Amino acid sequence: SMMKWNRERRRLQIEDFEARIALMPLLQAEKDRRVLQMLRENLEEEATVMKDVPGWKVGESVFHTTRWVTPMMGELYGLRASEEVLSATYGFIWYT
Amino acid sequence: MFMINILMLIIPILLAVAFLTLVERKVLGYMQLRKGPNVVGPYGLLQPIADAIKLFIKEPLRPATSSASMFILAPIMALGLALTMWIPLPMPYPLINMNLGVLFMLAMSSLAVYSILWSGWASNSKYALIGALRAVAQTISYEVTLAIILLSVLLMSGSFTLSTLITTQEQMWLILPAWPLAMMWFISTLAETNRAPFDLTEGESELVSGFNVEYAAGPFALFFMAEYANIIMMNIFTAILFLGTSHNPHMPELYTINFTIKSLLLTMSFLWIRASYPRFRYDQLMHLLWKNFLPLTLALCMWHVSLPILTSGIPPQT
Amino acid sequence: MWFEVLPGIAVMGVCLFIPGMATARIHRFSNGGKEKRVAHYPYQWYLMERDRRVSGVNRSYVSKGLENID
Amino acid sequence: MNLMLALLTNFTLATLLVIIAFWLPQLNVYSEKTSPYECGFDPMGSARLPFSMKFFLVAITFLLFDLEIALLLPLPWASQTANLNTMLTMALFLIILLAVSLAYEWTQKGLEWTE
Amino acid sequence: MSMVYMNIMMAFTVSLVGLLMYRSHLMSSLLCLEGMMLSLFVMAALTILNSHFTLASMMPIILLVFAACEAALGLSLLVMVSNTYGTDYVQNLNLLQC
Amino acid sequence: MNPIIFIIILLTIMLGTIIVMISSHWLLVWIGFEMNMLAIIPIMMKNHNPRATEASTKYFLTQSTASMLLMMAVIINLMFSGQWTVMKLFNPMASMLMTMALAMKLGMAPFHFWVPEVTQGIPLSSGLILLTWQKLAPMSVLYQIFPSINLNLILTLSVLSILIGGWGGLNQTQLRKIMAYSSIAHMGWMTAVLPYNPTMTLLNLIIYIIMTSTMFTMFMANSTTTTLSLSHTWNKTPIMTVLILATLLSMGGLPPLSGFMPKWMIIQEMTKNNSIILPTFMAITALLNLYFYMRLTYSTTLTMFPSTNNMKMKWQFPLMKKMTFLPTMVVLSTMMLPLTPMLSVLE
Amino acid sequence: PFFDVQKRLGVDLDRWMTIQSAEQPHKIPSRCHAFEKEWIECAHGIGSIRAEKECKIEFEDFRECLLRQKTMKRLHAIRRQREKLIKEGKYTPPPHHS
Amino acid sequence: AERVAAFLKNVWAKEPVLVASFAIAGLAVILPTLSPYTKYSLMINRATPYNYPVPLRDDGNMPDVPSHPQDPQGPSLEWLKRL
Amino acid sequence: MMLYIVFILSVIFVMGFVGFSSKPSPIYGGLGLIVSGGVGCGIVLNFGGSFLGLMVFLIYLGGMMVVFGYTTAMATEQYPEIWLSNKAVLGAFVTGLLMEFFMVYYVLKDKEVEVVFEFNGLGDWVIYDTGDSGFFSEEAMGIAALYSYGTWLVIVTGWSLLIGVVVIMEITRGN
């Protein structure tokens, strides 16, 4: 009984993972827009905040390479409220 | 709304513990041709309240030459862990839904041994320390079989989520393909809870004083409540683990009624067993573990690692 | 007689029934009549957080169907 | 947050019951009242409980079996791999090696209490 | 680095100094020895989990397994010392080089 | 113990050292040290006496403290490099932690106090493993991380080891404590040449192991552990006294004996690097080693100490001890100088 | 490896957990996979002496991804000036930063 | 054999727990090497999609790779539905 | 204020270490090490390691540390035992706490402190990964690889544990 029921559960899991693969292109596409939008929302505020400091280059990278480097949590939410940062940092870990 | 849920889980646990003492005294009484409490309130329904008030208005003695800090910590540690082992249980929805719930219940039950060790250590009583070392030796020894047996069953379930055991047993109870593990799990819970015939701690006739000997009044009550909250929790675990209940998302209360009746029957089996058999010697319940169960449990652990593979019946991961 | 133990068993049974009834009814109360979403893996969290931002309100149990599409 | 709140409410209730279990009752303590129970007779000797070797071995034996259990816990997740032959060989290696340890203690009189 | 790494590395240094300054109890020195493993376990997991070094997630377990085994060895010697002099005091271990 | 268990434990000592050598992962190197420490305690606690238990607690406490320091180096290396490969360390702090951890395992000054006392409490057979075999695993790691070791740290530990080893041995009458301080002194030479030519580290290690193994075996043959106990050997096995003289002279570095080969080669490599003061100091200071080696020769070979009457009964029984490889080793430790250019095999 | 038995016998004992960029289960990448892939390729076969000089740029980026030292200093600079103009009131948070 | 009919019956009368332990342990090691269904265990594990099936760039000479998921080319899980 | 849970746990982690590192009587050294072991599980959980965090509670606390207290109770006896331990522990605690206070003070004020290494006071959350959409736990998937990738580790790790049983019986047999 367990053998047949477990094999059915594997067929169900494949069905649930197929649904994920059907949506990953859409979720991936809108993640990139969200991430790039938040970086430009920090580049603009960087220009206004850092304008009298001498030698500052707004949007200067910290890497020698020009390759795209995935930002860390700090770069994205550098200028944002605590509530929207806690969920983006400890939202999953603390969810029951 | 969550803080209300915690109270809806904590208060009824203590009440169930309160009336489990009445049920034990009456079930054993009838198995002994007696009646049991039937004077304090109709059918003894007020006996638990009389005992609770009695204990907490009684003198809380602690010997002067005894570590106060560890003397007080043990009842706190014992009762705090007893209630903590209830938050991940699905009934059918758990208060706190953990991805590793089965593994969280092993960890919490492995800290409860400290309450026994601290109880007899902070008493400066030679007899009390003897009980603690024996009680600790018994407790940790039978944890080995709990962990290995539990791992063996989870090789048919797929994960450590307590709610996935409900999905595993949707077609059939796990007791049918795992009755050898159910037999050894049930007795391992009797010895883990220090119940008969594994209760030499309470067996003063054995010339041994229990670690809960130098405790009176309320602090004795806290040790008692934790012990009886573990009996119910272990039997709740023994039901969710080997006697699965079908979960209908639209009528959750149907699950809870059946799941509660199974919990009571397994919890009333402890009273039944306590009334029928003599005690083990301390060395006989160590051989029962190190020479009978563990050789068999390791054999069955191997079988349940390869049985899902040779039958092509490996459970999912998610 | 033996049926004088049932009154004590009944009280114990009712006490053990409340924890599962309270949790089941409370979750539906706090989640718009549905089960509380379960998220054991980051993919489920991403969708749950997506539903919180695809709701106008800052709640994940408010589901917007085709009526919200263009 | 929910878990950190559940643990706090569990131990606060336990702590509250102890403080009201110590400060509510009427107390009157004298020298014989606050002595260890013993068994009704005066204590024999002024030394603590002597050490027992058999109790140390069982505790150590539990630890070494407990550690090997720490390696067997991830079996449910390991049986999801494509290399089942290697996983099955390694899982049965640990359990057998865990059984060989049990046999060694058994035959060398490690499990006996008949000092 | 990060604020957390300061305290974890600060916790290792505290236990190393504790392990190098014996008071009288050999048991107390072993506790500081097992405090050093705990900080190593936390530091190892922090680096591994943060960097998503997937195959290194088993190293902290291996570190924990062997350290516990050497903890068992340490207690065995501590026990045998007690049976000789009746106490785990370290000032009784001065027969050699004296 | 049971003979089969004794074999199992010995293979675990060897297995641990081999794992440290064939490994490419810092975790496996740490595991080999832990496995090595596990299997060595039972052979030290085999006679079951108070002194042996003390020699094990002191050995356990030092090595365990060294394993943790060696572990903190590995993790600090992981944080700054992100890999576990056994090569140079990518952070100065890890280098200092690992160098000292390996200095504690080897027993180099000022982390040297445990070597004399541990070797005195444990039987002769275990002392041979303690002073010869246990040196291999730490030397393998130093051989691989040497282009990350602070040059002043390793050289400072080398000079102090020669001084402490030479000075400490002058005031000894116990054979197990003379070999302990001698071991400290030779560790200085091996580490002093490590930054310049690591091949000479292996050469001095090989010759040291051969010479030390010859000494312990000849002490075990007559079951001698004190200077006076060894001074009776002329009246039981006179040949064994000549071999001790030949080996003790070699360990002193006196030509034409083999023990001069490593001292000779190290002085060459250090001189090539325009280092003249340090080799001269090391060479001159090594005369302290020769002095307390010479005293044993006076009391063993070159003079006849007072015997005892009961010795008249030992002449009737032969030597039944194994004395394994002793004919071979005592020839490698005394008659190999002409084969000096064979050291290139170690490259 | 002191004794390169693994290379002689063509056996992989512990080389699989040496670096982050190797084959991980389920093809899970690490945070700094790309940077390590550039530093290992730059320094391959040129010995460590040339690597410390002729691959310094690659190892600078890879170190930055591991510890984020230069990224946090810049963010610290942003949060200093930004907080400076909160009492010397000239800057106000935008609606999407609240 | 008598040592087979006397050793087996003697232990079965004095150590029944151990006899069952070695029987169950023995079957764990042996049956997987003989069971016909062990090969289906690997294929189900290898047919469960955890990662995204990253597409290939069609160079024009890959007739074995489907262009659309519903095309009749590529792996088929028909063996699993029957199973 | 809750966004600094890891740093707050790390402070309690250090203070617990100053508890048993000052070496009070072995009874309260274990209590200090138990408390810091639990907080150590708190830090690991908040970085996404649940199996590793739980393994601390199950093995380090319910295992190794239970044996320490078990042995301490019977293999050790208490002589004038108290935190008031001949002024060596009292002055060890203040030095440890005072050292921690200044370090925390200069990291929460200057947001940076240079002691051996360079430390940053922005917050432990600033280094976390942005996120993924994965249907599995990476830490769990990396430990289940022990039986697929780490055959060598299992062989030596299993052998060491087996020998540890053999070694301990020899040491403690006494003859």
Curated annotation (Swiss-Prot), chain A:
Gene Ontology CC annotations of this record: cytoplasm; mitochondrial inner membrane; mitochondrion; nucleoplasm; respiratory chain complex I
Keywords for this protein: Acetylation, Apoptosis, Electron transport, Membrane, Mitochondrion, Mitochondrion inner membrane, Nucleus, Respiratory chain, Transmembrane, Transmembrane helix, Transport
Its membrane topology: Single-pass membrane protein
Gene Ontology molecular function: any one: NADH dehydrogenase (ubiquinone) activity
Subunit-level organization: Complex I is composed of 45 different subunits. Interacts with CARD15, but not with CARD4. Interacts with STAT3, but not with STAT1, STAT2 and STAT5A. Interacts with OLFM4.
Family designation: Belongs to the complex I NDUFA13 subunit family.
Protein name: NADH dehydrogenase [ubiquinone] 1 alpha subcomplex subunit 13
Organism encoding this protein: Bos taurus
Phylogenetic lineage: Eukaryota, Metazoa, Chordata, Craniata, Vertebrata
Curated annotation (Swiss-Prot), chain B:
Keyword Repressor tagged: no
The EC number(s) this enzyme carries: 7.1.1.2
Superkingdom: Eukaryota
Residues with N-formylmethionine modification: 1
Transmembrane segments: 2-22, 70-90, 100-120, 146-166, 172-192, 222-242, 253-273, 294-314
Principal EC category: translocase
One cellular component (GO) term of this entry: respiratory chain complex I
Matching InterPro entries: NADH_UbQ_OxRdtase_su1/FPO, NADH_UbQ_OxRdtase_su1_CS
Subunit comment: Core subunit of respiratory chain NADH dehydrogenase (Complex I) which is composed of 45 different subunits.
Protein name: NADH-ubiquinone oxidoreductase chain 1
Organism: Bos taurus (Bovine)
UniProtKB/Swiss-Prot annotation, chain F:
InterPro entries: Complex_I_Subunit_2 (IPR050175), NADH_DH_su2_C (IPR010933), NADH_UbQ_OxRdtase_chain2 (IPR003917), ND/Mrp_TM (IPR001750)
MF annotations from Gene Ontology: NADH dehydrogenase (ubiquinone) activity
Enzyme class: translocase
A GO biological process held by the record: mitochondrial electron transport, NADH to ubiquinone
Residues recorded with modification N-formylmethionine: 1
EC number in record: 7.1.1.2
Gene Ontology CC terms, in alphabetical order: mitochondrial inner membrane; respiratory chain complex I
Superkingdom in the source lineage: Eukaryota
Compartments in which it is found: Mitochondrion inner membrane
Annotated TM spans: 3-23, 25-45, 67-87, 96-116, 122-142, 145-165, 178-198, 200-220, 239-259, 274-294, 325-345
Membrane topology, as annotated: Multi-pass membrane protein
Keyword vocabulary terms for this entry: Electron transport, Formylation, Membrane, Mitochondrion, Mitochondrion inner membrane, NAD, Respiratory chain, Translocase, Transmembrane, Transmembrane helix, Transport, Ubiquinone
Keyword Endoplasmic reticulum: no
Keyword match Membrane: yes
Pfam families: NADH_dehy_S2_C (PF06444), Proton_antipo_M (PF00361)
Reaction it catalyzes: a ubiquinone + NADH + 5 H(+)(in) = a ubiquinol + NAD(+) + 4 H(+)(out)
Family: Belongs to the complex I subunit 2 family.
Function description: Core subunit of the mitochondrial membrane respiratory chain NADH dehydrogenase (Complex I) which catalyzes electron transfer from NADH through the respiratory chain, using ubiquinone as an electron acceptor. Essential for the catalytic activity and assembly of complex I.
Subunit (UniProt): Core subunit of respiratory chain NADH dehydrogenase (Complex I) which is composed of 45 different subunits. Interacts with TMEM242.
Descriptive protein name: NADH-ubiquinone oxidoreductase chain 2
Protein source organism: Bos taurus
Gene: MT-ND2
From Swiss-Prot, chain H:
One CC-aspect GO term: respiratory chain complex I
Disulfide bridge positions per record: none
Membrane-traversing stretches: 17-37
Region (Disordered): 55-83
Localization, UniProt: Mitochondrion inner membrane
N-acetylalanine found at: 1
Keywords of this entry: Acetylation, Electron transport, Membrane, Mitochondrion, Mitochondrion inner membrane, Respiratory chain, Transmembrane, Transmembrane helix, Transport
Entry membrane topology: Single-pass membrane protein
Family indicated by similarity: Belongs to the complex I NDUFA3 subunit family.
Its biological purpose: Accessory subunit of the mitochondrial membrane respiratory chain NADH dehydrogenase (Complex I), that is believed not to be involved in catalysis. Complex I functions in the transfer of electrons from NADH to the respiratory chain. The immediate electron acceptor for the enzyme is believed to be ubiquinone.
Self-association state and partner proteins as the record states: Complex I is composed of 45 different subunits.
Name of the protein described by the UniProt record: NADH dehydrogenase [ubiquinone] 1 alpha subcomplex subunit 3
